[PDB]
RNA sequence: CGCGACCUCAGAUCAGACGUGGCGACCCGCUGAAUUUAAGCAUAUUAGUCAGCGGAGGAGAAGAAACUAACCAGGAUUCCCUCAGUAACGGCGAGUGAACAGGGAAGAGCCCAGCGCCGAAUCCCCGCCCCGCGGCGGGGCGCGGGACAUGUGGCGUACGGAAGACCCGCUCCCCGGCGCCGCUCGUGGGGGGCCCAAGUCCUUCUGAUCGAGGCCCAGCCCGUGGACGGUGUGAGGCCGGUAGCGGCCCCCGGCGCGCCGGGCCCGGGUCUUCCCGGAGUCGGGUUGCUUGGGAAUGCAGCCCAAAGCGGGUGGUAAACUCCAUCUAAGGCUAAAUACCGGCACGAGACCGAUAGUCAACAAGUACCGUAAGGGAAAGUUGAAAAGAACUUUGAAGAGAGAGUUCAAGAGGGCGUGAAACCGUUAAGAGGUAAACGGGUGGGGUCCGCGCAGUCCGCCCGGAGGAUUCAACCCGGCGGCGGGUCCGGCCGUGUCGGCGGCCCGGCGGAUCUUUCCCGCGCGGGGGACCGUCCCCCGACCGGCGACCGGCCGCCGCCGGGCGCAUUUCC
RNA sequence: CCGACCCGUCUUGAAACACGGACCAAGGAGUCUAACACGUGCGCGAGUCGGGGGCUCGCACGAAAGCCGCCGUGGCGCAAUGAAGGUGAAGGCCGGCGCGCUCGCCGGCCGAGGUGGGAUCCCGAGGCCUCUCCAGUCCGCCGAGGGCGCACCACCGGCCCG
RNA sequence: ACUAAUCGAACCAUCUAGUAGCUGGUUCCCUCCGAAGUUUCCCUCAGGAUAGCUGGCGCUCUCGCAGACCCGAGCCACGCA
RNA sequence: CUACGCCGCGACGAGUAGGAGGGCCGCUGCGGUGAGCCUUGAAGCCUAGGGCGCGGGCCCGGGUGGAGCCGCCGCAGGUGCAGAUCUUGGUGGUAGUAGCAAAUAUUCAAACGAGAACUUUGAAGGCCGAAGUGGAGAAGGGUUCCAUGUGAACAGCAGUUGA
RNA sequence: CGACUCUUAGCGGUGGAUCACUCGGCUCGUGCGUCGAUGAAGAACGCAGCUAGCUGCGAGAAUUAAUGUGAAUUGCAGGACACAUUGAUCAUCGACACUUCGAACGCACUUGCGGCCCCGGGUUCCUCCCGGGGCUACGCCUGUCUGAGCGUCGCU
């Protein structure tokens, strides 16, 4: 029954809610397990960046967020084509690709291809056989200059 | 203190393990200190109790310097029986009084190849520890 | 408690025309349990009233600014001899209460040299008090693994570990604390300020960068500054005895006028 | 009027395999209420929930757009935060109720059919030989069978693809072992086994002690070990353990090099010529259920029934028109996620034998019901059985002695041992049932070291002692004051910035190369400003409760002298 | 000796011929979650909040605590109003001008108007002083009146949206 | 009528701690304040909402706070009943 | 002069439902603290013992007991019982009472035995009266069958007897 | 004076509260995350020198082997066991074994009864009896063998 002034309240507790209650006592354990998995993956891919492939510069869709820019899923095939990278070699050398993304304007295209060229300049490539360096890189710049990168590769900044 | 997350400090769990231990680790539980002379001779401190070694009681009603040979290691009741450590019962017969092996000290070991091997193993581990902590 | 506790009986009420209370009764026969009350908080073997549940909201979230404020208060109180004495930490021969030792202590390895350091710092009496206080707890904690209790000892605050934790940590009462990770639960153990703290020199120097001056914001917290006083001078005696206060006062009325018996 | 081939069927204890049933906490596909709420009740709600049926796995399902959007656009699935108790649904009542964008956890993409080309290039089975066994593979041989043109394999899949030329680059793949490293790695990768510090020191308490006191050298000994448990209490040092990138032994698994057996076949760019798609499906009508989906979100039954610049979607039915977006009717896929069942662990501000699981115990047991099913009660001698020998009465149960024990006023349902109730003893009382409140009185058990009644400050008098009383000397230590006497400084300003983007920081939505690397279009480096930083120094206020040195005064203490009309007991 | 009916409960009314209660022991009933509202305490304050995530020997305590800052996305607040398309909160004085036509073009100022109350604060004629006086040195108290007026209230104006 | 001592719908388990405006109960002490059975509306009349009666928390003001013992030195508060 | 303290003056004091404050009232556990207590005796319990407080309650003495417990500052509750035809367990009065009364019936002697109304043997008197109180089966029971021994409990008295 | 009744106290009964303890639960978290026709889960019946339950096991039956360990098990008895011409006990468990029902599989069961192929015996190959061993369920896949059809054809 209502009592004097108050807010008309509509609790959604008519549907036997106590059979489905998700407690979070395993939240610290989940954080520990996720951290351990991250560290194990980083050890597994030793010189490769821990966060993973480089992501493209991507403008947010709606009118609320189109002033901001973030990281996308993968570089578009047009970007790779004008940057001179094969769409099947990009994933091997650590470049995320998104075959279903299009380039409506040219400014975003050019920004992403300068991003790709900068990444390619900063990339250190190890030869398949360390005793036989075919075309990857000089041993001088991969002996001590190789280091696992922490955080996103070339983080997207407004 | 204890840091290993796989050994428990729970009182109930430790008591359950102790009272339901099988005999092959009840033997380790029922260990006794060696005398000062034996501790000097063999670089070991404690030894599991054995059927035919001579001990002396250092606590309880039967304290003294008399040396008695063990005659029974009753592992089910966690006790041992010694030669003259006994009492008369009502009908005039003598019964051995069981006392805990941690309350005796071994003065002479019953030595065979297995006891000797355990003795050198313990001494070697102790020496390695001393050289590590030097 | 178990959500099934007291509710796995299939009992039902007998009705009203059988000269017994209308509580549900266990069905069947041939056992003591048959015809006994069930499901009620008043019934033996029944369900407790309002069974305890895991979603009690065990945790509380505290504002970060308030937590930092409490850390600052605990640190400020730890440098006042009256408050540490009132916590009972036996500081009577300590040369200086904001006790700061050289960074060599951070590299200690053995427990003997930690004991020697405490003895030379005249902080060994607090450890002896902890030893004297090691007794047996009263109640159910003995069956719930809180078997032993003891006095809280001093808090060694360090900047960098080079073996100091291993050198200490076998001394009862001694609690070690990283300066970058100060814990209010260790600085005010019972919620009372004034725990005896021994500082390493590098930790003592890092305190300014950790919490800032009133002129500098903290360089290691990126938005934090020391809180302000609402009373700059707390010396009530000197404030009241100051001549400018005294000139403004009326004369005291120090005569007691007790009731007059009406003759 | 038989013999063959194919097709479609049948039998077999044919050769070799596979499925069934259980568990089912989590997951998938169905089926699916009513209690309840609406203060009645029928739609609604409960709820796509309980119950019912089927099917899995260590996860499952989902999943690489016939998507979201409408923006300067994002870009598989799943999970978290938020959107949001919102849009919306609803006797528009009660109530119900998402999604997009955004931030994160994780991140991985792909394969067919078709259209085509390639002498079916393809696959299974059976015999023979060799290399191997450890999950049964590799190689070779068979004018050995079979499947298969009613279509196997290679290339290839919407991100386009193929074939030709022209140019450029030879770029280096995976598979199972032989021997051994970095020794697998937050410091062993895992499993198992055995080990590794220090008091039973002296004196005492006790039935027993792990209790109490002590252990000269800054203090018994070890401590990377002071978790825990056991032991006749209450133990870091008696024992097991505990700590330790501690030791030793056994077994198993994946990481590089040289070799081994064999496979393994060309990649990119440009131009030209060709080729490009899933049908009783979409879609439409109607019906029923479902959804927040509202002129109908999804699913299904029935009827109609497609197209190819086509089709789907674009949250109000419809026609015309432009635009955007994807490419359905085939398939696979790890991670992040779930887990009240199972195996093995760890912990707790939880419960403590009417509690906590029904079950601390020969508990889903005893027992009950024809059955489905229902379902308890029940822990504790003692440190150790040392569990009462022996004598005695009785037919025995049961007693009296004796004995063990620290204790049987602990004697096998035995720790402690309340109340209700009962027996006996002692005291008191008793015809208005007991019991009760207020007020006295009597008796009684106890208490008061009750039983000659306190103390203590000064002074007077008496009779005795003793350093020493005061004042001076020396030394130490405090308190207070001092133009800052001398420093050390402290607060607020104030100057030259000698002082810092090389030789002090951090910031600025402040201006720039008009000195420096990207198209007249970025990133650096500078200048300025704001807070600074330690400094060279000065002036103002002060010695402050931030401290020292000198003096001055006072006080205390220690040692002298003072040895008697002082001082004290 | 005087006073004194048996408690609990529903009830206008219980000692009731109203119900429960033979006695004793142990157990036994406003709890937790979520959402609101108001009050109080604390921190910060036009802001506030890391709760989800991440970083820190991964773990006796510690499943804690600490930190993030281009993790502040986001929530709530800072703007309302309308079904919606949408729109969206500064005035007072001195002036020269049309025609200062109940209004259009600018300057100079100041920055949410005014009335009546309004704690507090400010000024304050005149008083209170000593052994006394003609003559002024410094400040303390009382003080009729007057002034600026906090919060808040009543009212009158003004501004935003329909 | 009978359908396992059960029949105008058996028994068992579950949904289920079904709902109840109705009955019963609802656990320590002291101190302070202290009611209502009336208005209006309700498929309302053994119940609610609503106003009233109650308590708690305050806040805004008024008289001054007087002489250190003592001693006033026409006019005597906002406002209320 | 624990300023959350201390002191003065004046008026006032009913109370259901209900509201609020205080609690150096009480229970359990956690963080601190008492160089707390304790085998030279903890908790619990008993007590014609001494007291304190308006009260909730508390302290001390004596006994029993045999291993743990408490004060203070905070924290947290499954935190206080006379009732609920309350739940479980235990115990009274009733009360040595109702009762041990359906189907005719027992008596004598002896034996064993501590013990005989009930056992056994003998004698006598009766009953079932062949549709039986006889002799054998089915269903159901499951060792009750048979011998020996015992006299705890059971056979609603007893038992030397017994399913 | 007694009995009886009441009150109080001492002692003794009845009863099992209180307190202390706890090899049990409850809750949370972690790592794994594995059944079965090669016969599971479940059930029954058996197995110890003295053994009813619980527990363990399966006619090799409170266990065999192997490995580790290293002198016991224990309520009583018995007997091992130079611990080295190898070893009690316990643990681990990878070898071996694992009765009858049960998806339960020759048919069927509140009972019982077959069929086929081998081996041994009574027989003295020939098949009657007895014993032992191996097979004999349903569905379904590939292949094989044997077939059916006034299905479609070819030759005659
Ligand atoms: Mg219960
Ligand atoms: Mg207690
Ligand atoms: Mg076959
Ligand atoms: Mg209803
Ligand atoms: Mg209703
Ligand atoms: Mg109804
Ligand atoms: Mg279900
Ligand atoms: Mg199945
Ligand atoms: Mg899957
Ligand atoms: Mg799928
Ligand atoms: Mg696709
Ligand atoms: Mg909101
Ligand atoms: Mg719904
Ligand atoms: Mg990520
Ligand atoms: Mg093909
Ligand atoms: Mg040791
Ligand atoms: Mg102990
Ligand atoms: Mg110990
Ligand atoms: Mg170890
Ligand atoms: Mg439209
Ligand atoms: Mg129980
Ligand atoms: Mg008990
Ligand atoms: Mg008898
Ligand atoms: Mg005793
Ligand atoms: Mg007893
Ligand atoms: Mg009595
Ligand atoms: Mg009533
Ligand atoms: Mg009436
Ligand atoms: Mg009454
Ligand atoms: Mg009457
Ligand atoms: Mg009546
Ligand atoms: Mg009634
Ligand atoms: Mg009655
Ligand atoms: Mg009753
Ligand atoms: Mg109670
Ligand atoms: Mg944290
Ligand atoms: Mg924002
Ligand atoms: Mg005003
Ligand atoms: Mg107005
Ligand atoms: Mg009910
Ligand atoms: Mg009524
Ligand atoms: Mg009153
Ligand atoms: Mg309760
Ligand atoms: Mg009661
Ligand atoms: Mg009678
Ligand atoms: Mg009779
Ligand atoms: Mg007759
Ligand atoms: Mg007959
Ligand atoms: Mg018989
Ligand atoms: Mg009888
Ligand atoms: Mg008694
Ligand atoms: Mg063996
Ligand atoms: Mg038959
Ligand atoms: Mg034919």
mmCIF file with all atom_site columns, C-alpha atoms (C1' of nucleotides) in Angstrom, chain A residues 24, chain D residues 79-83 101-104, chain E residues 50-52 73-74:
data_model
loop_
_atom_site.group_PDB
_atom_site.id
_atom_site.type_symbol
_atom_site.label_atom_id
_atom_site.label_alt_id
_atom_site.label_comp_id
_atom_site.label_asym_id
_atom_site.label_entity_id
_atom_site.label_seq_id
_atom_site.pdbx_PDB_ins_code
_atom_site.Cartn_x
_atom_site.Cartn_y
_atom_site.Cartn_z
_atom_site.occupancy
_atom_site.B_iso_or_equiv
_atom_site.pdbx_formal_charge
_atom_site.auth_seq_id
_atom_site.auth_comp_id
_atom_site.auth_asym_id
_atom_site.auth_atom_id
_atom_site.pdbx_PDB_model_num
ATOM 1  C CA    . UNK A 1 24  ? 30.905 -12.455 -7.831  1.00 0.00 ? 24  UNK A CA    1
ATOM 2  C "C1'" . C   D 2 79  ? 31.095 -12.725 -21.795 1.00 0.00 ? 79  C   D "C1'" 1
ATOM 3  C "C1'" . C   D 2 80  ? 31.370 -8.073  -18.453 1.00 0.00 ? 80  C   D "C1'" 1
ATOM 4  C "C1'" . C   D 2 81  ? 30.066 -2.504  -17.517 1.00 0.00 ? 81  C   D "C1'" 1
ATOM 5  C "C1'" . U   D 2 82  ? 26.599 0.834   -19.547 1.00 0.00 ? 82  U   D "C1'" 1
ATOM 6  C "C1'" . C   D 2 83  ? 22.709 1.949   -22.642 1.00 0.00 ? 83  C   D "C1'" 1
ATOM 7  C "C1'" . A   D 2 101 ? 26.208 3.053   -30.508 1.00 0.00 ? 101 A   D "C1'" 1
ATOM 8  C "C1'" . G   D 2 102 ? 30.455 3.466   -26.361 1.00 0.00 ? 102 G   D "C1'" 1
ATOM 9  C "C1'" . G   D 2 103 ? 34.313 1.064   -22.889 1.00 0.00 ? 103 G   D "C1'" 1
ATOM 10 C "C1'" . G   D 2 104 ? 36.515 -3.548  -21.900 1.00 0.00 ? 104 G   D "C1'" 1
ATOM 11 C "C1'" . G   E 3 50  ? 36.338 3.092   -10.932 1.00 0.00 ? 50  G   E "C1'" 1
ATOM 12 C "C1'" . G   E 3 51  ? 31.723 -0.303  -8.825  1.00 0.00 ? 51  G   E "C1'" 1
ATOM 13 C "C1'" . G   E 3 52  ? 33.737 -3.225  -14.741 1.00 0.00 ? 52  G   E "C1'" 1
ATOM 14 C "C1'" . U   E 3 73  ? 33.448 4.737   -21.376 1.00 0.00 ? 73  U   E "C1'" 1
ATOM 15 C "C1'" . G   E 3 74  ? 29.590 5.614   -18.432 1.00 0.00 ? 74  G   E "C1'" 1
#
